[PDB]
Amino acid sequence: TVLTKGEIVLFALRKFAIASNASLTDVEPQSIEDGVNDLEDMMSEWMINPGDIGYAFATGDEQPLPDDESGLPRKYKHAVGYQLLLRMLSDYSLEPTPQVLSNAQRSYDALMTDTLVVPSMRRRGDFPVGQGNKYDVFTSDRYYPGDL
Amino acid sequence: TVLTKGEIVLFALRKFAIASNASLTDVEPQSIEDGVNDLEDMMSEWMINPGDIGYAFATGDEQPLPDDESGLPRKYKHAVGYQLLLRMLSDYSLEPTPQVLSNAQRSYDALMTDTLVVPSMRRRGDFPVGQGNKYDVFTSDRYYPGDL
Amino acid sequence: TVLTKGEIVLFALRKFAIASNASLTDVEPQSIEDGVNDLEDMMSEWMINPGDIGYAFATGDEQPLPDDESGLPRKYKHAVGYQLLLRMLSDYSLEPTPQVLSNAQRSYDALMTDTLVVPSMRRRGDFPVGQGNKYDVFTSDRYYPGDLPLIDGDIPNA
Amino acid sequence: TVLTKGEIVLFALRKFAIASNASLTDVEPQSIEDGVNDLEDMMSEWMINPGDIGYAFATGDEQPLPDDESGLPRKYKHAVGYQLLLRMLSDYSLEPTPQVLSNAQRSYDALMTDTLVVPSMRRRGDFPVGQGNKYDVFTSDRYYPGDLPLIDGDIPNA
Amino acid sequence: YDTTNPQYNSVSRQVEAGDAVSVVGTASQTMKPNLFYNKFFCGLGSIPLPKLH
């Protein structure tokens, strides 16, 4: 099982009952390619605030196609789909429900939990190391190196 | 008495009366496959925040099936089913009721009660060890280890 | 006496008037079957927050049977039935009322007060015992016992 | 790859379904011209407060055309399109929705995070340098420069 | 044999494909070998152990 942009877009469309397999009415491929374009730009914009999650972009000149693989794990599928749903409902001029908002918030919090990393503050660089660290023989530093 | 994906999905659909014996409605095939793959994706997402709970995944390139053995413990059935119902209702655009929300919260709390850790913070590493422990002078046992 | 699972399920249905003895229309067998099933899932989950309360489970992977003996005291049936009703109301597309909620809360509190713990935390172990307790050479007891690990000559690290 | 003002305006129109490709089979050239002119003016305004982000204005004096290349990186187009949509919605007299407002807010906030500087506080200039910094041997003097220090000596005025 | 950092070369030429190799010794001989080394070739230490209470 490998996640694909088309699969993500279809999931986002189904989750709010705009279009699905069981439905008797279906949307033109223009809408599908607009959705995959929206996914591409949103995930390219995601390179700054949330960070990097392993998404694979179009190789320069080539346009994105739904049949290609994004490379994301199965874990981030709901997060990506819910964000795409929230960004795409306005196209059909609809309003998300509170339950949908809560589910999207929970999954986005899970994504932040996965991505989170906290730094550590190194010593200033003029801080003495102390006579107890054997700076004469064991360590060559009389003061901490600082940030690298 | 082992659990099955088909059994878990059916419980969720009956709980809001989308398909149940009390109503005269019968399961539609399309609703069941959606339940199965939604359950699998939700478990894949759950592999982070609630932690591993014993779910058995589908071997690569093979789609999950309702007859496959889930491997989940019996006690987690209500929690898993209620979370599935909450992330399912948007498909039919129903609205959860306060009692359903309260039951889901109760089941989630009960499930989370059995997975607490309380990491029990350890010693520092340069903290002196007193003379009451009668440490060995040659060994490096005058101070606490305080590491992995 | 027997306090059968089917009796508990019928109690839960009766107190919300889904179907009673003085009713022209009744529920079909599989509704009772699902009620008993949900009863046992709820009771199996109840082994975490409220703790074991003496429920008897089906051993030997048999399907639950409504006429089997639950094994619970009669002082628990109202609480069990009320908690079962709150889980089962949605299936019948109905919503709970303030009086039912208050009764369920009261019965649940009555059940809870019967299963207290009061862990009564211990003393440390390096806390000295006073010189007035007259400790001795052989029995030790100069300091309070603690976790008291059982160290074996083999397995020295652990 | 390449970002075109025409496709930015088309995205802005589609995101509120003023002229989409599924609901409606019509796009108006007057709307396109108004949108591209609004984008040009808004970028000219943005040149000061949020700072330059790499947009290219029309050289000379001929009016911009939708087929030209904006030069914006693809990670800014959502913010640009949303901020444009909010500005041009009055003409069709359609009020905006809270979801659209929230999405525009998040996109603009992300752009703001991408375009931060956070400058540091330089020394005053009359603040003495410590005796332990070894002046008269190192390049340091008794006092901080308080201005960009000389880097070459061939150009000593600055 | 590094062509970017020649400072650490310790052999005349690179081991290219098809070079001739051999194994020193005999088919299944068994023997007790002699040894020779410098002071700083190998190092040995003994970790002291803690007392069990």
Side-chain angles (χ1 to χ4, degrees):
Chain A
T1 59
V2 164
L3 200 56
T4 53
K5 326 203 183 98
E7 171 176 0
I8 301 163
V9 166
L10 293 181
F11 159 86
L13 261 185
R14 165 175 55 88
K15 268 313 189 154
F16 183 75
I18 291 166
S20 167
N21 303 339
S23 88
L24 301 97
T25 300
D26 173 288
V27 310
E28 296 93 333
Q30 171 80 296
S31 297
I32 311 297
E33 65 183 1
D34 291 331
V36 75
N37 281 285
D38 291 331
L39 179 63
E40 181 76 0
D41 312 289
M42 161 179 103
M43 191 85 48
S44 61
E45 186 273 329
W46 269 25
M47 282 314 268
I48 62 170
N49 188 7
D52 208 5
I53 62 170
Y55 186 81
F57 304 92
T59 67
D61 53 58
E62 271 305 347
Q63 274 170 38
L65 281 293
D67 293 318
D68 291 331
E69 62 209 52
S70 64
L72 299 177
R74 304 287 296 174
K75 328 182 306 287
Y76 303 146
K77 163 179 180 256
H78 288 171
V80 167
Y82 273 129
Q83 300 300 327
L84 178 71
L85 193 143
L86 290 180
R87 265 173 158 76
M88 281 205 308
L89 289 191
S90 175
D91 203 328
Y92 304 80
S93 77
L94 296 173
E95 181 78 28
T97 66
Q99 187 49 245
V100 165
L101 300 157
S102 170
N103 295 318
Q105 202 275 340
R106 187 168 287 259
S107 167
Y108 196 68
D109 186 74
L111 175 68
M112 294 296 172
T113 310
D114 212 18
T115 300
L116 168 61
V117 62
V118 296
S120 295
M121 321 195 318
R122 294 201 90 141
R123 264 78 174 195
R124 191 182 178 181
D126 55 5
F127 199 90
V129 65
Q131 283 203 112
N133 267 0
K134 305 288 183 70
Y135 62 74
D136 62 358
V137 298
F138 182 76
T139 300
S140 181
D141 312 290
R142 314 221 201 91
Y143 294 71
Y144 281 117
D147 264 345
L148 277 298
Chain B
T1 53
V2 76
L3 290 193
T4 61
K5 277 157 226 186
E7 185 208 70
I8 299 160
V9 168
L10 274 168
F11 162 82
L13 289 179
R14 138 159 129 268
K15 195 57 83 232
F16 224 59
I18 304 140
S20 199
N21 209 93
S23 267
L24 287 193
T25 344
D26 197 40
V27 354
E28 31 167 70
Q30 190 89 240
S31 71
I32 288 300
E33 202 86 50
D34 189 358
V36 172
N37 64 7
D38 213 338
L39 182 63
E40 190 276 331
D41 284 87
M42 183 203 58
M43 291 325 317
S44 66
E45 178 174 276
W46 266 30
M47 294 298 102
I48 190 167
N49 197 326
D52 175 1
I53 62 170
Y55 195 77
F57 288 101
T59 285
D61 294 8
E62 171 96 347
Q63 273 184 340
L65 280 168
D67 291 331
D68 292 332
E69 169 207 89
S70 69
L72 268 186
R74 176 71 67 155
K75 55 181 176 289
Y76 296 164
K77 176 180 178 288
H78 270 177
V80 162
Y82 273 106
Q83 302 308 311
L84 188 60
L85 182 66
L86 271 296
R87 284 211 210 131
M88 190 168 270
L89 285 184
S90 164
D91 283 13
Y92 315 87
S93 84
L94 271 296
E95 282 301 319
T97 81
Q99 192 46 44
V100 173
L101 299 159
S102 173
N103 288 32
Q105 188 274 331
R106 282 205 54 111
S107 304
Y108 199 43
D109 177 347
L111 158 67
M112 201 154 277
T113 289
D114 194 85
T115 318
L116 270 194
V117 176
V118 185
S120 81
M121 170 166 36
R122 254 171 81 81
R123 290 282 153 91
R124 185 164 170 89
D126 66 344
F127 194 90
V129 176
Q131 284 193 355
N133 315 131
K134 289 170 78 68
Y135 44 71
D136 297 349
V137 183
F138 291 166
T139 62
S140 49
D141 291 331
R142 305 188 221 199
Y143 290 81
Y144 280 124
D147 63 358
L148 60 87
Chain C
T1 73
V2 289
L3 199 46
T4 79
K5 301 185 209 53
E7 182 65 26
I8 289 177
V9 161
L10 283 188
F11 174 81
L13 270 68
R14 179 164 66 68
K15 298 292 180 68
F16 212 65
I18 301 299
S20 172
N21 284 8
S23 62
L24 312 180
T25 74
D26 201 298
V27 302
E28 53 88 24
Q30 189 190 15
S31 283
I32 292 145
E33 191 78 25
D34 298 306
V36 179
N37 224 327
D38 291 331
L39 168 60
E40 301 206 290
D41 309 278
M42 182 181 71
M43 211 65 48
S44 46
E45 172 181 72
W46 268 21
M47 302 273 155
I48 301 299
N49 196 348
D52 188 335
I53 62 170
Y55 192 59
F57 283 111
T59 68
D61 65 17
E62 293 83 3
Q63 206 172 8
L65 183 63
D67 272 28
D68 201 294
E69 271 96 340
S70 81
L72 284 164
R74 284 245 167 189
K75 72 208 189 175
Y76 283 178
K77 67 173 293 183
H78 274 282
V80 169
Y82 272 128
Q83 295 299 305
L84 177 65
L85 173 76
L86 262 345
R87 315 225 164 193
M88 271 183 358
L89 268 200
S90 178
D91 301 313
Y92 292 103
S93 73
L94 284 166
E95 280 295 287
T97 81
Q99 195 46 52
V100 162
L101 292 151
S102 167
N103 297 347
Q105 188 274 331
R106 269 184 84 111
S107 187
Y108 197 56
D109 194 289
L111 186 142
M112 273 274 146
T113 192
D114 198 35
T115 301
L116 266 180
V117 293
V118 288
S120 177
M121 65 182 179
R122 194 51 41 100
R123 287 188 181 89
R124 214 165 175 249
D126 73 324
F127 190 94
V129 75
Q131 202 173 183
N133 275 41
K134 271 152 162 143
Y135 49 84
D136 65 288
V137 65
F138 184 66
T139 308
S140 294
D141 203 2
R142 314 172 39 150
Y143 278 77
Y144 275 130
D147 288 333
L148 187 43
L150 273 299
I151 181 177
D152 188 27
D154 304 333
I155 298 89
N157 41 60
Chain D
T1 308
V2 286
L3 277 296
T4 47
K5 331 198 191 183
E7 91 186 2
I8 307 187
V9 174
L10 282 188
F11 167 88
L13 284 190
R14 159 171 73 83
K15 203 50 91 166
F16 210 75
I18 304 172
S20 165
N21 308 124
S23 296
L24 183 63
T25 63
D26 173 6
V27 191
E28 266 194 340
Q30 297 180 359
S31 298
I32 305 298
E33 284 303 295
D34 292 14
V36 59
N37 276 131
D38 284 343
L39 180 48
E40 191 56 350
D41 297 357
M42 156 198 297
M43 291 328 267
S44 293
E45 171 197 309
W46 271 24
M47 181 85 168
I48 61 170
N49 174 347
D52 185 74
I53 55 176
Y55 189 80
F57 307 92
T59 61
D61 50 352
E62 71 275 60
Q63 44 163 310
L65 291 179
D67 63 358
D68 297 321
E69 311 76 0
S70 78
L72 275 173
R74 214 159 273 266
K75 58 169 183 289
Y76 292 144
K77 71 163 291 184
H78 275 175
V80 161
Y82 274 124
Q83 297 300 317
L84 189 61
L85 168 66
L86 281 204
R87 282 209 213 238
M88 320 166 329
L89 256 195
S90 179
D91 189 39
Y92 318 87
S93 73
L94 306 166
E95 269 255 314
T97 54
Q99 193 46 56
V100 166
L101 301 157
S102 190
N103 279 352
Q105 195 277 293
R106 314 221 311 151
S107 303
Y108 196 57
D109 181 79
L111 189 140
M112 291 295 337
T113 61
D114 184 29
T115 315
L116 270 193
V117 301
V118 176
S120 67
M121 292 214 57
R122 284 270 270 180
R123 289 301 204 284
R124 185 177 179 179
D126 59 348
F127 185 68
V129 176
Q131 192 148 266
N133 277 51
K134 300 294 189 294
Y135 43 82
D136 289 324
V137 292
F138 205 69
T139 75
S140 178
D141 283 334
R142 304 81 180 290
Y143 291 85
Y144 279 92
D147 71 296
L148 191 121
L150 177 64
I151 46 128
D152 253 0
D154 262 326
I155 327 127
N157 29 285
Chain E
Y1 187 74
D2 189 358
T3 193
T4 302
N5 287 291
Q7 308 105 20
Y8 296 108
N9 283 304
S10 80
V11 70
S12 69
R13 71 187 279 283
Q14 201 167 22
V15 186
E16 293 179 353
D19 286 336
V21 302
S22 76
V23 177
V24 177
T26 307
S28 290
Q29 213 193 49
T30 178
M31 84 291 283
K32 189 179 289 292
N34 306 288
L35 274 161
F36 83 103
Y37 52 87
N38 192 48
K39 183 71 174 177
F40 292 88
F41 168 47
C42 291
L44 172 64
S46 79
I47 309 302
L49 289 178
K51 174 260 174 153
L52 289 158
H53 276 290

